[PDB]
């Protein structure tokens, strides 16, 4: 039994969701805040990429992944900007194909951002743990991981758009995304969870190593400050969304629809903060701002 016959109205009415044919106080507020967040993300990433490209000084693998994070967050800004101008009464203008387009853009954009954060974490671990001064660095592992990030982002944003969704199982799928399945939400959330715990172990290993070696002999303050603020942005912008989705797929009678529109705004605010978390420390690049 598979049915793409019905419209969006059938899917919403099957879920707990409400179409909201009419504008709302909440709808106007979220539109303003979302467009503000989107404008901020787009502007901040344009500056980061412009600076990363204009200076030949910033033509090294770490700055490559930095510019990649700027581009991924700009992609996220665009996806959230297009999700707006499609919410509230405008959602009623959607079809199955277009709705899947919207949600797919969101999935691939955020997956790309999370993967860029993991990649930058893995790179810093490698750079710190090498035992040479110069080590003429090639452009091989940076472009390898750039294509892994984008491949994983695109495969993850396309899987539900094709095969892994409840077009075939109306009974067994999400409360928030009426068409994505509990299997897909579990997978996306366990993916993000293991990525966060991987970033946590890597930066802790960095701190432990630097501590042991340099304390055998201020850097400690700067390293702990940077580490805490990098993981903190991730935890305070993702733990909400991840726990909310697990609740949707695991917990009966967990009213999780109520704080959904806001948790996604928090997850986009993550991508809002990323270009400035990854550019505040580098005095040189920061000052390049002129």
């Amino acid at each position: 039994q598979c049915f793409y016959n019905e419209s969006i109205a059938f899917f919403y009415n099957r879920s707990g969701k409400h179409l909201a044919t009419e504008w709302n106080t909440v709808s106007k507020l979220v539109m303003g805040l979302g467009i503000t967040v989107c404008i901020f993300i787009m502007l901040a990433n344009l500056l980061v990429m412009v600076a990363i490209y204009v200076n030949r000084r910033f033509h090294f693998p770490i700055y490559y992944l930095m510019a990649n994070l700027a581009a991924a967050d700009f992609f996220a800004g665009l996806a959230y900007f297009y999700l707006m101008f499609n919410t509230g009464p405008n959602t009623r203008r959607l079809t199955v194909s277009t709705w899947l387009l919207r949600q797919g853009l969101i999935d691939t954009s955020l997956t790309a951002s999370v993967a860029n954060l993991l990649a930058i974490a893995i790179e810093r671990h490698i750079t710190v743990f090498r035992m040479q001064l110069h080590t003429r660095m090639s452009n091989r592992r940076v472009v390898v991981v750039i294509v892994v990030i984008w491949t994983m982002a695109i495969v993850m944003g396309a899987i539900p758009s094709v095969g892994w969704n409840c077009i075939c199982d109306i009974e067994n799928c999400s409360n928030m995304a009426p068409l994505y399945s509990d299997s897909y939400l579990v997978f996306w959330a366990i993916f993000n969870l293991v990525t966060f715990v991987v970033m946590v172990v890597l930066y802790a290993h960095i701190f432990g190593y630097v501590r042991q070696r340099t304390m055998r002999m201020d850097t400690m303050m700067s390293l702990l400050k940077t580490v805490v603020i990098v993981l903190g942005a991730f935890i305070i912008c993702w733990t909400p969304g991840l726990v909310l989705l697990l609740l949707d797929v695991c917990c009966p009678q967990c009213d999780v629809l109520a704080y959904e529109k806001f948790f996604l705004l928090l997850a986009e605010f993550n991508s809002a903060m990323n270009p400035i978390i990854y550019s505040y420390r580098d005095k040189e690049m920061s000052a390049t701002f002129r």
């Binding site: 770490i62 750079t127 710190v128 040479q132 190593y209 055998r216 002999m217 850097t219 420390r281 690049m285």
Partner: peptide
């Protein structure tokens, strides 16, 4: 030995902007 690794590790920190 330690001063060099520190010079390396600290330097690794420098170009990588993680410092």
């Amino acid at each position: 030995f330690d001063a060099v690794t520190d010079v390396i590790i600290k330097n690794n920190l420098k170009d990588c902007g993680l410092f």
